[PDB]
Design a protein around this motif. Structure first.
Motif, PDB file in Angstrom:
ATOM      1  N   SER A  65     -80.102  -9.296 -12.992  1.00  0.00           N
ATOM      2  CA  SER A  65     -81.079  -8.236 -12.788  1.00  0.00           C
ATOM      3  C   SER A  65     -80.368  -7.103 -12.036  1.00  0.00           C
ATOM      4  CB  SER A  65     -82.300  -8.755 -12.024  1.00  0.00           C
ATOM      5  OG  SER A  65     -81.920  -9.506 -10.886  1.00  0.00           O
ATOM      6  N   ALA A  66     -81.118  -6.083 -11.619  1.00  0.00           N
ATOM      7  CA  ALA A  66     -80.545  -4.920 -10.935  1.00  0.00           C
ATOM      8  C   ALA A  66     -80.206  -5.209  -9.461  1.00  0.00           C
ATOM      9  CB  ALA A  66     -81.462  -3.708 -11.082  1.00  0.00           C
ATOM     10  N   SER A  67     -80.980  -4.633  -8.539  1.00  0.00           N
ATOM     11  CA  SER A  67     -80.787  -4.819  -7.098  1.00  0.00           C
ATOM     12  C   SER A  67     -81.222  -6.208  -6.640  1.00  0.00           C
ATOM     13  CB  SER A  67     -81.534  -3.739  -6.311  1.00  0.00           C
ATOM     14  OG  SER A  67     -81.254  -3.824  -4.923  1.00  0.00           O
ATOM     15  N   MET A  68     -82.292  -6.721  -7.249  1.00  0.00           N
ATOM     16  CA  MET A  68     -82.766  -8.078  -6.982  1.00  0.00           C
ATOM     17  C   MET A  68     -81.821  -9.132  -7.556  1.00  0.00           C
ATOM     18  SD  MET A  68     -86.922  -8.353  -6.883  1.00  0.00           S
ATOM     19  CE  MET A  68     -87.317  -7.157  -8.154  1.00  0.00           C
ATOM     20  N   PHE A  69     -81.884 -10.321  -6.951  1.00  0.00           N
ATOM     21  CA  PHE A  69     -80.950 -11.463  -7.078  1.00  0.00           C
ATOM     22  C   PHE A  69     -80.085 -11.600  -5.828  1.00  0.00           C
ATOM     23  CE2 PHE A  69     -76.553 -12.862  -7.858  1.00  0.00           C
ATOM     24  CZ  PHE A  69     -76.763 -14.227  -8.016  1.00  0.00           C
ATOM     25  N   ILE A  70     -79.258 -10.585  -5.559  1.00  0.00           N
ATOM     26  CA  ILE A  70     -78.426 -10.531  -4.345  1.00  0.00           C
ATOM     27  C   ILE A  70     -79.274 -10.177  -3.126  1.00  0.00           C
ATOM     28  CG2 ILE A  70     -76.058 -10.251  -5.187  1.00  0.00           C
ATOM     29  CD1 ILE A  70     -76.776  -7.044  -4.739  1.00  0.00           C
ATOM     30  N   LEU A  71     -80.453  -9.619  -3.394  1.00  0.00           N
ATOM     31  CA  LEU A  71     -81.490  -9.382  -2.397  1.00  0.00           C
ATOM     32  C   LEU A  71     -82.095 -10.703  -1.899  1.00  0.00           C
ATOM     33  CD1 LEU A  71     -83.706  -6.280  -2.570  1.00  0.00           C
ATOM     34  CD2 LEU A  71     -84.887  -8.412  -2.000  1.00  0.00           C
ATOM     35  N   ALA A  72     -82.092 -11.721  -2.762  1.00  0.00           N
ATOM     36  CA  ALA A  72     -82.697 -13.031  -2.470  1.00  0.00           C
ATOM     37  C   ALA A  72     -81.990 -13.925  -1.421  1.00  0.00           C
ATOM     38  CB  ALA A  72     -82.969 -13.807  -3.757  1.00  0.00           C
ATOM     39  N   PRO A  73     -80.627 -13.981  -1.397  1.00  0.00           N
ATOM     40  CA  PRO A  73     -79.995 -14.689  -0.267  1.00  0.00           C
ATOM     41  C   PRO A  73     -80.098 -13.958   1.075  1.00  0.00           C
ATOM     42  CG  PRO A  73     -78.329 -13.744  -1.705  1.00  0.00           C
ATOM     43  CD  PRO A  73     -79.629 -13.690  -2.443  1.00  0.00           C
ATOM     44  N   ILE A  74     -80.276 -12.636   1.034  1.00  0.00           N
ATOM     45  CA  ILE A  74     -80.596 -11.842   2.229  1.00  0.00           C
ATOM     46  C   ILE A  74     -82.016 -12.198   2.693  1.00  0.00           C
ATOM     47  CG2 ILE A  74     -80.665  -9.537   3.292  1.00  0.00           C
ATOM     48  CD1 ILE A  74     -78.938  -8.594   0.800  1.00  0.00           C
ATOM     49  N   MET A  75     -82.930 -12.342   1.731  1.00  0.00           N
ATOM     50  CA  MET A  75     -84.305 -12.792   1.984  1.00  0.00           C
ATOM     51  C   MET A  75     -84.379 -14.264   2.401  1.00  0.00           C
ATOM     52  SD  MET A  75     -86.894 -10.462   1.548  1.00  0.00           S
ATOM     53  CE  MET A  75     -88.331 -11.004   0.625  1.00  0.00           C
ATOM     54  N   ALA A  76     -83.391 -15.058   1.984  1.00  0.00           N
ATOM     55  CA  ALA A  76     -83.321 -16.480   2.331  1.00  0.00           C
ATOM     56  C   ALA A  76     -83.007 -16.700   3.810  1.00  0.00           C
ATOM     57  CB  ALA A  76     -82.315 -17.206   1.446  1.00  0.00           C
ATOM     58  N   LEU A  77     -81.920 -16.091   4.285  1.00  0.00           N
ATOM     59  CA  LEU A  77     -81.489 -16.220   5.679  1.00  0.00           C
ATOM     60  C   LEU A  77     -82.295 -15.334   6.628  1.00  0.00           C
ATOM     61  CD1 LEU A  77     -77.581 -16.172   5.273  1.00  0.00           C
ATOM     62  CD2 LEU A  77     -78.879 -18.205   5.913  1.00  0.00           C
ATOM     63  N   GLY A  78     -82.514 -14.080   6.228  1.00  0.00           N
ATOM     64  CA  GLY A  78     -83.188 -13.077   7.061  1.00  0.00           C
ATOM     65  C   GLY A  78     -84.676 -13.273   7.299  1.00  0.00           C
ATOM     66  N   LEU A  79     -85.220 -14.389   6.811  1.00  0.00           N
ATOM     67  CA  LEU A  79     -86.622 -14.756   7.028  1.00  0.00           C
ATOM     68  C   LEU A  79     -86.785 -16.185   7.562  1.00  0.00           C
ATOM     69  CD1 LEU A  79     -88.197 -13.222   3.755  1.00  0.00           C
ATOM     70  CD2 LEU A  79     -88.373 -12.174   6.019  1.00  0.00           C
ATOM     71  N   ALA A  80     -85.758 -17.014   7.362  1.00  0.00           N
ATOM     72  CA  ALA A  80     -85.747 -18.400   7.848  1.00  0.00           C
ATOM     73  C   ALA A  80     -85.038 -18.567   9.195  1.00  0.00           C
ATOM     74  CB  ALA A  80     -85.140 -19.329   6.807  1.00  0.00           C
ATOM     75  N   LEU A  81     -84.051 -17.710   9.463  1.00  0.00           N
ATOM     76  CA  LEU A  81     -83.352 -17.695  10.755  1.00  0.00           C
ATOM     77  C   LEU A  81     -84.123 -16.918  11.826  1.00  0.00           C
ATOM     78  CD1 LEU A  81     -79.700 -17.032   9.482  1.00  0.00           C
ATOM     79  CD2 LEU A  81     -80.353 -19.137  10.662  1.00  0.00           C
ATOM     80  N   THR A  82     -85.007 -16.019  11.386  1.00  0.00           N
ATOM     81  CA  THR A  82     -85.917 -15.281  12.278  1.00  0.00           C
ATOM     82  C   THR A  82     -87.001 -16.185  12.871  1.00  0.00           C
ATOM     83  OG1 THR A  82     -87.196 -14.536  10.343  1.00  0.00           O
ATOM     84  CG2 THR A  82     -85.612 -12.971  11.283  1.00  0.00           C
ATOM     85  N   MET A  83     -87.239 -17.321  12.210  1.00  0.00           N
ATOM     86  CA  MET A  83     -88.192 -18.351  12.642  1.00  0.00           C
ATOM     87  C   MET A  83     -87.832 -18.998  13.985  1.00  0.00           C
ATOM     88  SD  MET A  83     -90.870 -19.280  10.499  1.00  0.00           S
ATOM     89  CE  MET A  83     -90.992 -21.035  10.155  1.00  0.00           C
ATOM     90  N   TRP A  84     -86.550 -18.927  14.351  1.00  0.00           N
ATOM     91  CA  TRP A  84     -86.040 -19.445  15.626  1.00  0.00           C
ATOM     92  C   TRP A  84     -86.504 -18.638  16.844  1.00  0.00           C
ATOM     93  CZ3 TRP A  84     -83.060 -23.949  16.078  1.00  0.00           C
ATOM     94  CH2 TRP A  84     -82.622 -24.510  14.859  1.00  0.00           C
ATOM     95  N   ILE A  85     -86.845 -17.368  16.618  1.00  0.00           N
ATOM     96  CA  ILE A  85     -87.260 -16.433  17.678  1.00  0.00           C
ATOM     97  C   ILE A  85     -88.615 -16.797  18.343  1.00  0.00           C
ATOM     98  CG2 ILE A  85     -87.485 -13.987  18.365  1.00  0.00           C
ATOM     99  CD1 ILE A  85     -85.832 -13.441  15.630  1.00  0.00           C
ATOM    100  N   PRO A  86     -89.696 -17.044  17.551  1.00  0.00           N
ATOM    101  CA  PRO A  86     -90.975 -17.398  18.200  1.00  0.00           C
ATOM    102  C   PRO A  86     -91.062 -18.803  18.824  1.00  0.00           C
ATOM    103  CG  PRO A  86     -91.202 -17.528  15.832  1.00  0.00           C
ATOM    104  CD  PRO A  86     -89.891 -16.851  16.098  1.00  0.00           C
ATOM    105  N   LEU A  87     -90.039 -19.638  18.616  1.00  0.00           N
ATOM    106  CA  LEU A  87     -89.986 -20.999  19.170  1.00  0.00           C
ATOM    107  C   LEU A  87     -90.096 -21.022  20.699  1.00  0.00           C
ATOM    108  CD1 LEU A  87     -87.145 -22.800  17.128  1.00  0.00           C
ATOM    109  CD2 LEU A  87     -89.543 -23.497  17.115  1.00  0.00           C
ATOM    110  N   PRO A  88     -91.005 -21.866  21.247  1.00  0.00           N
ATOM    111  CA  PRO A  88     -91.248 -21.920  22.697  1.00  0.00           C
ATOM    112  C   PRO A  88     -90.061 -22.439  23.518  1.00  0.00           C
ATOM    113  CG  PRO A  88     -92.442 -23.678  21.588  1.00  0.00           C
ATOM    114  CD  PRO A  88     -91.898 -22.785  20.514  1.00  0.00           C
ATOM    115  N   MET A  89     -89.408 -23.507  23.040  1.00  0.00           N
ATOM    116  CA  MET A  89     -88.207 -24.102  23.667  1.00  0.00           C
ATOM    117  C   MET A  89     -88.448 -24.456  25.159  1.00  0.00           C
ATOM    118  SD  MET A  89     -85.840 -24.529  21.256  1.00  0.00           S
ATOM    119  CE  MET A  89     -84.158 -24.458  21.866  1.00  0.00           C
ATOM    120  N   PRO A  90     -87.387 -24.506  26.005  1.00  0.00           N
ATOM    121  CA  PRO A  90     -87.680 -24.341  27.436  1.00  0.00           C
ATOM    122  C   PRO A  90     -88.208 -22.939  27.764  1.00  0.00           C
ATOM    123  CG  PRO A  90     -85.314 -24.650  27.016  1.00  0.00           C
ATOM    124  CD  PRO A  90     -86.063 -25.124  25.814  1.00  0.00           C
TER     125      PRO A  90
END
Ligand SMILES: NC(=O)c1ccc[n+]([C@@H]2O[C@H](COP(=O)([O-])OP(=O)(O)OC[C@H]3O[C@@H](n4cnc5c(N)ncnc54)[C@H](OP(=O)(O)O)[C@@H]3O)[C@@H](O)[C@H]2O)c1
Ligand code: SF4
Ligand code: SF4
Ligand code: SF4
Lengths: 313, 176, 138, 206, 111, 106, 147, 111, 372
Positions: A65-90
């Motif tokens: 496809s055009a811009s999409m496809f390579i947009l998807a691994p950016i969407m893979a990490l850049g939305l799943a690694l951001t999940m670590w931020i709201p974590l309460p932790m200590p």
């Protein structure tokens, strides 16, 4: 800000060192030796894959496809690694005004990684693995919010900081006995290394979000897909586990929190090896037909309980 | 004889229905299945790493072809075209001319590894026991030309395996 | 029960080598084990045996560093060990230098050779027949 | 005999009754030649009607075979008529094996066994591929054991074992795999044939 | 009247024509749907030379057998099956020898 | 009670007697001199008498079937189809077709 | 000078560490290829991880007989592989037909379709002998990029 | 800052793609194919509807997701308002959702 | 499982018409055997199937034994059953392990392949090859059982009884299999009989029929056999019968261990079976018959013969046509692979893409069968 950079680089290493456990524990479960040759106990092999898959492996899809496809691994990490931020932790990185709302929203946004990989190849072969990935996730998003609500009404509000303080004497596994059993199944809504799982592994069909992707985007998908497994394991260890708080000594909490999560980290790979795939049609019949009336009956039960006996934050 | 796969409903009344319903409501038997691989994790793996440890074998085993010779020199192969006819792949080729004066033993002797299904037929068909199959494993080449065996020579270079062959053939005469 | 298990691991490291010897059996060698050794072998192979462990296993054995002219301690293959593969490691029960006698022929190669594969001085194809001769005279 | 004979004939007399039973119907349309040797029965059938023969042996009360499991064909150029389709049949209730044959040259179309048997159509595809025998009123005659662009029939004795088009190079063309190259390695034609006939009674008068 | 095959001597001529029409419409469809390969104009001439080699007409049994065979090798793209640009290409591409001269073939030394 | 095959064993007696009485009438339309009529009748008449003698016992099912009445009914259900096909295509009564070329020995 | 020469070996160390095979279910050789996953003779995370999909893998193992029906199929799979690719033709069928060779359908030696780097001669390819097919592969990777 | 926390993770993720994009380069032949995974030429070119099978179950999610969002007040609203007046109304939304799923039992669909 | 094209026609996601464009692995064994002698053509049958070794050649050698009308020695007959049942330990394991791997189960594949690699040691000790061996020959059995096997078979079978039941506690009792595999492709009617699967399927569900009890090969009916037959024609019952075949397989092996007459391995006739190595070196007649059993070998009596021995997948319907010479001109191996793939037109009617995979595993279409 230094804390964010100290929560990506050591975290990517945890997803890297997962590859050991993904065939060491899974190996001994199948009575076979895993990592052995590369390092002292194969410890140099997980870091070798980063040299293997990124620097030398070059593929880009054909018809594409055009811009999409390579947009998807950016969407893979850049939305799943951001999940670590709201974590309460200590102690949390920017403690949210409402905690679990950001955890539930970004998890559903992380599903798009396997969705945009359907339009990665214009050919119809790849999108069958995407259409299967829709239903294997779309139904399980219903209960994931409902079972949360029954736990959240029992203890505190949406804020993840209050969920640590509420468990001072006993765990939340014992009051929420059928609901804790649900979060071994409902956690596997996202495409994870499991028996229930989604359209990601091979076995019967072609590999979803992998047949279209290379090595470099495809390597970036695993650094996000296996990252969600740890994320659900920590999130279960907040909602259902706790043991102690101790604000004076963070050292006593950090050791005790990791052991509780690591026992759950083994448990999903325990599930993966043990049982076959549930089929596209019949996974839609496990929930919705059978489990949704059970969860709502417990949701009905958990509404009455704070009114029956005082339980308001 | 009939073994019958059908159980014809194990549940009947009260006690037999509730326990069959309990396993379907929660899990129980899946946790029992979870504990099956728990004990499998506890027991030691039967694994062999190749560069140091080696796997079990037999006194009679076939690998890469090597032709034998008599204790006091001389080629043991007599040139018959016998082993050529038995060969289902027809990998072995043989053409013979008289060796100077007296003895008449071979000129062309190629065994192609492009073919050969490894029967042990040529090991059994040979009356003089020239081709005796050794316990070979290591063979890896860059080209097909390096893979297929030339006019004896490399097959004659089976002397490095002939010491094992002499020990293996002691189990061959008066079979096992 | 727990005290004997930790003591068994410490005795294995103390028995074979020491401090520098244990690291050579960990980094280069895949599995570390100590027991009985045959000793005598061509080039410099260790050849260990007489261990219980599991069925179809005869100890670590180990490959020699620089066997003929490869000059490698990190890289090892099945080219190692002389004409002795039919015993100790597989098939036969008797040890190649202790009980089982090797048969003399005065034709077999004295020095064992490793497979070249990619390296020079390897296998080659060659013609055999002189064919039909052609002659022309002035 | 201890190791000389395989088995003694005892059911052969009962199996010979089958060779008479079908022959008692006596059609020139069906019967022709009945041969029975080594605990088995062989019948060859006239090309004009094969479907009515296949409906027989199936369903019938005295002989309930039904299952027409295996389907073979012979390649032989000695006779004036070339190919010979051979049906191998088995009974599950009766427990017996019988054989059905055809005699025609069958370069010209032959009757199909698809209305009688459901799995026979897949075996019918094998015959058309290997030999070149067309079945009349056959549903979907697809190629199975042949290449997508294959000329002739790969099993016939009239053409060589190596084949006309067989070698496939990648060569100068970027993606298209070649076909026209025909040379292959030499298969040694064994001209061995032993003198003296091994068996008596098999010798035929000139 | 043995054997039928499919049609009579005169009727067999129009059965090939019916097969020709279906295959003549497929050469523009085997470029856009499949691969670019060569050309539409050169593709049609490759069809015409195939039928000229088969042109004899002496028996109805031979002609009708070519129709059924023609309803498989040319039916390979009708219901759309995979050929992978290696099949369906009838004419040789990597084969360049076409020598018909006593002077030409004898210089190369053959037969 | 359940049968081995997909066809369920329905509790019906005299049902087997209907199909066997039907096929006897079909045979007496075109072939009379032919052996096909004369040989099939003696099997059916022997089988019909066994049904009349036995009163709904498993021994009646054990008489030349031994897989219950449901398996025997399937042979009777397809008996009418094969009898009608034998009458439609002339082969049993007529014998006048050509013979193949004299060759058999391999 | 010295850092440049050692960096090229570090990239080659990644291929020396791990290589993912392709599950070519082509013949009987594929059954012994499954024995590589079998515990007794293992390369499971010794240097081999089974995952399939030609786009992700580094090494493809042609496991058995190839025919004219399979020659266009295998060719583009090799083309679907990332450019640092290695082909191991395992078995006599992969080297030029077990028997066959003089047969009509079988393509001779795989090298007519796709180039091969490491040959394994074994019909029933014994797992002991199969282990060289990956160990010699790692040993053959010596030097890449001088300038 | 929430903005500085989210962007630093996103910029590091996209930078890792560039490392895998520019470093490995040597040759790009006409070798890459449309379907992959199993091989052969794609019989189904471009895009075709497929559709159906899960059309009813997917639609119901869009309808149910709004109700679960309306159930989100429960742990956060029941703090100031009277419980006895809320009890009749809070359960009311959960009861009717079970009624809609009871109507879903009488012929669920093709799924 | 590779090399099964299976071009799908889907009205949505479910299958309406399934036409497998198979025969891609057509090695061409049929025309290739025509130019070989009987001894030369022997190991082809072993390399036909991928799982069965001694179950193959068994059908081929018996056909030569029925052509020559010469009985194998009584000792060799008992080895043939001992190795005929040992192939069922390989085939029915692959009918479970790869079948479960096709669905998504990871454990059971490696649970039994450690056992399987120990199983090939019995093959290696009895014949020089790992998988396919020319051990079964028209002269009964080629080579004697070594002294280090009968102690090993008994030791292996004693530990196997618990090992097979470990799969049942892992797979059969679970909800996952009882939810999935139940009610897929229920074919038990007269139409199932009209496809002719022979082994399993009909044996697995419906008709109580087997060749093991009805048609003896080499000393049968004397050995007590147990045949598992289900009720419904679904994938779950077609799986259970194969596991019940495995639990009731050791009984045959144990009876073969107890009943062994010490005697001859090959037939005394040197016209059919080659003489001993010590025998040929001294006496004259033995060496000439050894010389003549190659080049132009057996010399077969003319006449068409058809034999079928029950495979763990179905039947090997070998049809040999014989001339005066020792070359068998054309034979067809009628493996169940053609029969099982023909059933996919009815098996996949009204089914999803995921359980079509499960149909292939339960039928066990190991594509080595699909050649002739
Ligand atoms: N532009 C055109 O297409 C065009 C137009 C008109 C005429 N031509 C003529 O046609 C020819 C086309 O060839 P090309 O350009 O396609 O070849 P190329 O791609 O440059 O390949 C030449 C190969 O030879 C090796 N090589 C060359 N010089 C070397 C050196 N000094 N040291 C070490 N290795 C060396 C290189 O190996 P490494 O990469 O390992 O160094 C390279 O792989 C030219 O020679 C030119 O005269 C071309
Ligand atoms: S190897 Fe043996 S059989 Fe073959 S030609 Fe030499 S002596 Fe004769
Ligand atoms: S082992 Fe078999 S194929 Fe190989 S050379 Fe000997 S006879 Fe020929
Ligand atoms: S080389 Fe041997 S084992 Fe491998 S596929 Fe060919 S016949 Fe089978």
């Amino acid at each position: 800000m230094i804390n964010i950079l100290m929560l990506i680089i050591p975290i990517l290493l945890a997803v890297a060192f997962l590859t050991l456990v993904e065939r060491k524990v899974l190996g001994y479960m199948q009575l076979r030796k895993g990592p052995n040759v590369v390092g002292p106990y194969g410890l140099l092999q997980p870091i070798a894959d980063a040299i293997k898959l990124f620097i030398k492996e070059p593929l880009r899809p054909a018809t594409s496809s055009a811009s999409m496809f390579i947009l998807a691994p950016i969407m893979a990490l850049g939305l799943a690694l951001t999940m670590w931020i709201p974590l309460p932790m200590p102690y949390p990185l920017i403690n949210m005004n409402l905690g679990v709302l950001f955890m539930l929203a970004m998890s559903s946004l992380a599903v798009y990684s396997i969705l945009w990989s359907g339009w990665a190849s214009n050919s119809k072969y790849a999108l069958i693995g995407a259409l299967r990935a829709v239903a294997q996730t779309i139904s399980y998003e219903v209960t994931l919010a409902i079972i949360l609500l029954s736990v959240l009404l029992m203890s505190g509000s949406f804020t993840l900081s209050t969920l640590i303080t509420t468990q001072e004497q006993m765990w939340l596994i014992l009051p929420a006995w059928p609901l804790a059993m649900m979060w071994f199944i409902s956690t596997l809504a996202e495409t994870n290394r499991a028996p229930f799982d989604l359209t990601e592994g091979e076995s019967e069909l072609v590999s979803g979000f992998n047949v279209e992707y290379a090595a470099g985007p495809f390597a970036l998908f695993f650094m996000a897909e296996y990252a969600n497994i740890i994320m659900m394991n920590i999130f279960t260890a907040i909602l259902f586990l706790g043991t102690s708080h101790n604000p004076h000594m963070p050292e006593l909490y950090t050791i005790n929190f990791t052991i509780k999560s690591l026992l759950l980290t083994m448990s999903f790979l325990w599930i993966r090896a043990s049982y076959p795939r549930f089929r596209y049609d019949q996974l839609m019949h496990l929930l919705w037909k059978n489990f949704l009336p059970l969860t709502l009956a417990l949701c009905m039960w958990h509404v009455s309980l704070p009114i029956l006996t005082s339980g308001i934050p | 004889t009939y073994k019958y796969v059908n159980l014809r409903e194990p549940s009947m009344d009260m006690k037999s229905v509730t326990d069959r319903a309990a396993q379907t409501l929660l899990w129980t038997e899946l946790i029992r299945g979870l504990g099956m691989t728990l004990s499998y994790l506890f027991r030691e793996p039967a694994t062999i790493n190749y560069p140091f440890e080696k796997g079990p074998l037999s006194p009679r085993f076939r690998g890469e072809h090597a032709l034998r010779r008599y204790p006091s020199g001389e080629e043991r192969c007599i040139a018959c075209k016998l082993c050529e006819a038995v060969c289902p792949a027809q990998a072995i080729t043989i053409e013979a001319e008289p060796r100077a004066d007296g003895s008449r033993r071979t000129t062309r002797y190629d065994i192609d590894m492009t073919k050969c299904i490894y029967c042990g037929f040529c090991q059994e068909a040979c009356p003089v026991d020239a081709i005796v199959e050794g316990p070979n494993f290591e063979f890896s080449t860059e080209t097909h030309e390096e893979l297929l065996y030339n006019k004896e020579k490399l097959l004659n270079n089976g002397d490095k395996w002939e010491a094992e062959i002499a020990a293996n053939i002691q189990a061959d005469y008066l079979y096992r | 029960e727990l005290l004997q298990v930790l003591k068994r691991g410490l005795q294995q490291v103390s028995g074979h080598g020491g401090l520098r010897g244990y690291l050579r059996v960990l980094f280069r060698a895949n599995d570390v084990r100590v027991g009985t050794l045959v000793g005598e072998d061509k080039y410099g192979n260790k050849y260990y045996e007489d261990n219980k462990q599991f069925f179809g296993r005869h100890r670590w054995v180990i490959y020699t560093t620089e066997m003929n002219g490869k000059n490698t301690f990190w890289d090892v293959d099945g080219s190692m060990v002389p004409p002795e593969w039919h015993r100790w490691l597989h098939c036969m029960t008797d040890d190649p230098p202790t009980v089982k006698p090797p048969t003399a022929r005065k034709f077999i190669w004295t020095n064992h050779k490793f497979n070249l594969s990619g390296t020079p001085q390897q296998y080659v194809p060659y013609s055999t027949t002189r064919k039909k001769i052609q002659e022309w005279v002035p | 005999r201890p190791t000389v004979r395989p088995r003694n004939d005892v059911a052969h007399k009962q199996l010979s009754a089958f060779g008479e039973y079908v022959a008692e119907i006596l059609p020139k349309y069906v019967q022709q030649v009945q041969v029975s040797c080594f605990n088995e029965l062989e019948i060859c059938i006239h090309p004009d009607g094969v479907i009515p023969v296949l409906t027989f042996l199936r369903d019938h009360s005295n002989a309930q075979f039904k299952s027409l499991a295996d389907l073979t064909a012979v390649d032989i150029p000695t006779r004036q008529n070339r190919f010979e389709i051979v049906y191998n049949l088995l009974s599950l209730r009766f427990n017996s094996r019988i054989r059905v044959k055809t005699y025609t040259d069958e370069l010209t179309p032959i009757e199909s066994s698809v209305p009688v048997y459901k799995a026979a159509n897949w075996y019918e595809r094998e015959i058309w591929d290997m030999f070149g025998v067309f079945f009349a009123n056959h549903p979907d005659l697809r190629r199975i054991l042949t290449d997508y662009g294959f000329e002739g029939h790969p099993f016939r004795k009239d053409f060589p074992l190596s084949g006309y088009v067989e070698l496939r190079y990648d060569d100068e063309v970027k993606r298209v795999v070649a076909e026209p190259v025909e040379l292959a390695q030499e298969f040694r034609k064994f001209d061995l044939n032993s003198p003296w006939e091994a068996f008596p009674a098999y010798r035929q008068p000139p | 009247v043995k054997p039928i095959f499919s049609r009579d001597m005169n009727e067999a001529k129009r059965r090939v024509r019916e097969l020709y029409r279906a295959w003549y419409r497929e050469v523009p469809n085997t470029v856009h749907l499949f691969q670019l390969d060569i050309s539409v104009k050169q593709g049609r001439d490759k069809v015409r030379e195939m039928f000229k080699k088969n042109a004899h007409i002496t028996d109805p049994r031979v002609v009708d057998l070519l129709v059924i065979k023609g309803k498989m090798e040319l039916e390979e793209t009708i219901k759309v099956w995979k050929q992978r640009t290696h099949v369906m290409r009838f004419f040789h591409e990597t084969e360049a020898p076409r020598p018909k001269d006593f002077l030409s073939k004898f210089y190369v030394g053959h037969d | 009670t359940g049968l081995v095959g997909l066809a369920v064993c329905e509790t019906p007696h005299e049902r087997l007697k209907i199909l066997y009485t039907k096929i006897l009438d079909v045979l007496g339309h075109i072939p009379k001199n032919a052996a096909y009529r004369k040989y099939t009748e003696q099997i059916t008449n022997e089988k019909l008498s066994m049904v009349k003698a036995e009163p709904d016992v498993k021994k009646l099912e054990e008489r030349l079937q031994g897989g219950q009445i449901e398996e025997v009914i399937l042979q009777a259900e397809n008996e009418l189809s094969l009898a009608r096909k034998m009458i439609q295509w002339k082969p049993w009564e007529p014998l006048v077709e050509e013979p193949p070329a004299s060759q058999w020995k391999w | 000078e010295y850092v440049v020469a050692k960096l090229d070996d570090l990239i080659n160390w990644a291929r020396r560490s791990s290589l993912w095979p392709m599950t070519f279910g082509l013949a009987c050789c594929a059954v012994e290829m499954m024995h590589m996953a079998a515990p007794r003779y293992d390369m499971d995370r010794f240097g081999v991880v089974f995952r399939a999909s030609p786009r992700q893998s580094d090494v493809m193992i042609v496991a058995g007989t190839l025919t004219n029906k399979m020659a266009p199929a295998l060719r583009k799979v090799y083309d679907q592989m990332p450019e640092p690719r290695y082909v191991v033709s395992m078995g006599s069928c992969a080297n030029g037909g077990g028997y066959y060779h003089y047969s009509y359908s079988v393509v001779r030696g795989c090298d007519r379709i796709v180039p091969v780097d490491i040959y394994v001669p074994g019909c029933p390819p014994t797992a002991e002998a199969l282990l060289y097919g990956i160990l010699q592969l790692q040993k053959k990777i010596k030097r890449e990029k001088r300038l | 800052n929430l903005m500085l926390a989210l962007l630093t993770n996103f910029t590091l993720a996209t930078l890792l793609v560039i490392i895998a994009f520019w470093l490995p380069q040597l040759n790009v032949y006409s070798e890459k194919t449309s379907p992959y995974e199993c091989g052969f030429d794609p019989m189904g070119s471009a895009r075709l509807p497929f559709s159906m099978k899960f059309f009813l179950v997917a639609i119901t999610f869009l309808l149910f997701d709004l109700e679960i969002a309306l159930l989100l007040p429960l742990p956060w609203a029941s703090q100031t308002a009277n419980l006895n007046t809320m009890l009749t109304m809070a359960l009311f939304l959960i009861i009717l959702l079970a009624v809609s799923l009871a109507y879903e039992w009488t012929q669920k669909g093709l799924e | 499982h590779g090399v099964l094209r299976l071009v799908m026609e889907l009205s949505g996601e479910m299958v309406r018409k399934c036409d497998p464009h198979i025969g891609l692995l057509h090695r061409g064994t049929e025309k290739l055997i025509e130019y070989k002698t009987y001894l030369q053509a022997l190991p082809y049958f072993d390399r036909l199937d991928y799982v069965s070794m001694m179950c193959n050649e068994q059908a081929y050698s018996l056909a030569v034994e029925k052509l020559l009308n010469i009985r194998p020695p009584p000792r060799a007959q008992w080895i043939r059953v001992l190795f005929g049942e040992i192939t069922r330990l390989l085939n029915h394991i692959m009918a479970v392990t790869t079948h479960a791997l096709d669905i998504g189960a990871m454990t059971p594949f490696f649970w039994m392949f450690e056992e399987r690699e120990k199983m090939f040691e019995f093959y290696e000790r009895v014949s020089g090859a790992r998988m396919h061996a020319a051990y079964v020959r028209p002269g009964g059995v080629h080579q004697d059982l070594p002294l280090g096997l009968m102690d090993d078979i008994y030791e292996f079978s004693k530990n196997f009884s618990l090992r097979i039941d470990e799969l049942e506690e892992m797979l059969t009792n679970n909800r996952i299999w009882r939810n999935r595999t139940v009610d897929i492709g229920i074919v038990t009617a007269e139409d199932a009989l009209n496809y002719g699967f022979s082994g399993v399927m009909l044996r697995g569900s419906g008709i109580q029929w087997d060749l093991r009890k009805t048609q003896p090969y080499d000393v049968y009916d004397q050995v007590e056999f147990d045949v598992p037959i289900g009720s419904r024609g679904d994938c779950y019952d077609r799986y259970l019968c194969r596991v019940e075949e495995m639990r009731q397989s050791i009984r045959i092996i144990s009876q073969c261990l107890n009943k062994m007459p010490p005697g001859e391995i090959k037939v005394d006739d040197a016209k059919v079976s080659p003489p001993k190595r010590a025998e040929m070196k001294t006496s004259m007649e033995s060496l000439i018959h050894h010389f003549k059993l190659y080049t132009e070998g057996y010399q077969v009596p003319p006449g068409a013969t058809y034999t079928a021995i029950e495979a763990p997948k179905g039947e090997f319907g070998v049809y040999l046509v014989s001339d005066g010479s020792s070359r068998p001109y054309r034979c067809k191996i009628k493996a169940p692979g053609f029969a099982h793939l023909a059933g996919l037109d009815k098996m996949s009617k009204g089914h999803m893409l995921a359980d079509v995979v499960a149909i292939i595993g339960t039928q066990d279409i190991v594509f080595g069968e699909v050649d002739r």
